[PDB]
Structure 1
Amino acid sequence: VHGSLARAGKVRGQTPKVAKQEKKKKKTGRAKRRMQYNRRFVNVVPTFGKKKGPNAN
């Protein structure tokens, strides 16, 4: 069939629950802007590649 009215919540009920694991907390407020001003602007990147964005792989 083509999912008539039952199996609502089909894909969420059968996904595996990988646990949200933990790391040290992120900086908040003023300190958050410090740790990302330095990441973008004071660190000139010596390598090229058409200047890929921050969430690269």
Structure 2
Amino acid sequence: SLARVGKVRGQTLKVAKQEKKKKRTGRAKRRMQYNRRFVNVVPTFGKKKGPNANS
């Protein structure tokens, strides 16, 4: 059967992409990245947290 085409894409409930502050492009994108990779980290014993990690 080819009647079940696009089954999920129609029935996946919409979520309006909410407005959020745009990230600073260019070299400043690397200026902010370099900050939270070297200069703000504290020595914390325990396993290293992933950049998106949440449980």
> If the TM-score is normalised by the length of the shorter chain, which range does it land in?
0.7 to 0.9
Greater Rg, structure 1 or structure 2? 1
Q: For structure 1, list consecutive stretches of 5 or more residues without a partner in the other structure.
A: none
Instruction: Give the helix-richer structure, 1 or 2.
Output: 2
Q: Tell which deviates more after alignment, 44-53 or 16-25.
A: 44-53
* Corresponding pairs, count: 54
Q: CA deviation at 1:47?
A: 2.6
Find the aligned partners of 2:14 and 2:44 in 1 and give their Cα distance.
39
Give the superposed CA RMSD.
1.3
TM-score by length of 1: 0.80
